[PDB]
């Protein structure tokens, strides 16, 4: 897929919200545990994401997620416009379950699962693929 | 410099704490506004960082930052061992000052400054250099 496309969705676990961003072309994930599912939290997440990777386009399974003025302002400022994703989210949810008792806080288990997911060789890992896709696109 | 070396330090602004991670070889920055300067916050930041980039070694200007059991546990689990940095932190502090009135929250201004810093061409940007350094190291 195009190297600037990311998918963002929230999932719920233990009464908390996990914002999951998938780089569609590599399967690479960025995730954070947010206090609430709000436009301000999504906007802040998008600003962080766009400063770290070249974010061109964002996709989601819940269109209404992107209607706040806060989200529209983040996309405006950062210059963002509006199978794999289902699979990557499924893998992450499974990994969180597998490491959950190794940590007190869900947020810690989430970051351990992101780490495991991005480094797992499938033969390259999602972390290796994103860096290869973005470097070759710059070239 | 070696591609797995990162420098982590905290700086203070408006009574808040900004954790700044610099990828020494590229000048690329990752930053977060943390509620307090604690071992638990540093450990959590390191886990997130290590799941996104291949973190081999961490440097700091304040050695005591890395003594908590929480930090030692994050480095153990993620397999981490213990001019440019001064310049990158200086540039970020200047950029935050330059964009500060464009946002209500300091954390928003911080992420705008990270974005500006990583995308600025110096001729490649810090964001372009990190992806090139890591991709060629995998190759
Ligand atoms: C806190 C916050 N609110 C925002 C927005 C945007 C709309 N609103 C709603 C609103 C409503 C009434 C107002 F009087 C008012 F001033 C803003 C940004 C925001 C979001 C993204 C963003 C920018 C802004 C200002 C500036 C350029 C980079 O991208 C904010 C913002 O905070 C979050 C990122 C946490 C949402 C902020 O700190 O100002
Ligand atoms: C909350 C937290 N505390 C930690 C630690 C480690 C030591 N301590 C102190 C402590 C003291 C007394 C205990 F009875 C006790 F159980 C742990 C991790 C932590 C930090 C990093 C880390 C791991 C753990 C458990 C597991 C493998 C991946 O890396 C935590 C941890 O929370 C933060 C990351 C926010 C610090 C957690 O959720 O358990
Ligand atoms: C992306 As959900 C709020
Ligand atoms: C609002 As988004 C593109
Ligand atoms: C890195 As400072 C706490
Ligand atoms: C504790 As760190 C290397």
Numbering used by the authors:
A (entry chain A), B (entry chain A): 56 to 137, 149 to 188, 193 to 209
Reproduce passages from the article:
To investigate the mechanism of GSK002 resistance further, we determined three high-resolution crystal structures, one of GSK002 bound to catalytic core domain-only, one of GSK002 bound to the catalytic core domain containing the Ala124 substitution, and one of GSK002 bound to the catalytic core domain with Thr125. These two substitutions were chosen for study because they were the most influential in reducing GSK002 IC50 in the study of diverse HIV isolates. The protein structures were quite similar, with RMSDs ranging from 0.09 to 0.13 Å in pairwise comparisons. However, the azaindole core of the bound GSK002 ligand is seen to shift in position by ~0.5 Å, depending on the identity of the substitutions at residue 125, along with movement of the difluorobenzyl group by almost 1 Å. Larger substitutions at residue 124 and 125 would create a steric clash with the polypeptide backbone of the IN CTD, disrupting the inhibitor-mediated interaction.
The catalytic core domain (residues 50–212) adopts an RNase H superfamily fold and contains a D,D-35-E motif that binds Mg2+ or Mn2+ ions, which mediate DNA cleaving and joining. IN function is assisted by the cellular cofactor lens epithelium-derived growth factor (LEDGF/p75), which binds tightly to a site at the catalytic core domain dimer interface.
